[PDB]
Design a protein around this ligand. Structure first.
Ligand SMILES: O=P(O)(O)O[C@H]1[C@@H](OP(=O)(O)O)[C@H](OP(=O)(O)O)[C@@H](OP(=O)(O)OP(=O)(O)O)[C@H](OP(=O)(O)O)[C@H]1OP(=O)(O)O
Ligand SMILES: [Cl-]
Ligand SMILES: [Cl-]
Ligand SMILES: [F-]
Ligand SMILES: [Mg+2]
Ligand SMILES: [Mg+2]
Ligand SMILES: [Mg+2]
Length: 134
């Protein structure tokens, strides 16, 4: 069940999944419909689901990683697609081999230096590139 803010924007949560506390390398996943493109893993908050809980759940489903939840980076709108995403830092401590989206839709994952993550997100996901700006 998709959930919405009072202005009709879909509610989402995502994590910047860093390899370590140095926050130098981040895990991106393939687009579901366009597997040659990269995205920041994330998805819809469920009814009454805390944003931090949604963020960690979606990263597990889409990227097959777990770790230590860190700070809220910010809340980011996509005006054209009408969604609003809570973005958290996650420091990855567990990388699991056969995760929900790998099994179900063959979703890929890959580590990027922050500057390269910004580069591959810019064209189709400029708001997700902006998650890294600060
Ligand atoms: O363009 P489309 O139809 O292929 O889907 C878009 C997006 O549609 P929008 O742009 O219309 O909002 C989906 O949101 P919806 O509006 O359908 O709910 C979104 O799901 P999401 O919010 O993350 O929600 P969860 O499924 O994770 O909960 C999905 O992410 P994937 O999870 O990766 O499939 C995106 O694909 P892309 O970014 O390419 O991978
Ligand atoms: Cl790192
Ligand atoms: Cl976006
Ligand atoms: F999802
Ligand atoms: Mg999802
Ligand atoms: Mg998603
Ligand atoms: Mg979901």
């Amino acid at each position: 069940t998709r959930t919405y803010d009072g202005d009709g924007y879909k509610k989402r949560a995502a994590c910047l999944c860093f390899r370590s506390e140095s926050e130098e390398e981040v895990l991106l996943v393939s687009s579901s419909r366009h597997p040659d493109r990269w995205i920041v893993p994330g998805g819809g908050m469920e009814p009454e689901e805390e944003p931090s809980v949604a963020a960690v759940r979606e990263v597990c489903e889409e990227a097959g990683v777990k770790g230590t939840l860190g700070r809220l980076v910010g809340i980011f709108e996509n005006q054209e697609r009408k969604h609003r995403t809570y973005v958290y830092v996650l420091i990855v401590t567990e990388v699991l081999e056969d995760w929900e989206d790998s099994v179900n839709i063959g979703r890929k994952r890959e580590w990027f230096k922050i500057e390269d993550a910004i580069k591959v997100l810019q064209y189709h996901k400029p708001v997700q590139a902006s998650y890294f700006e600060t």
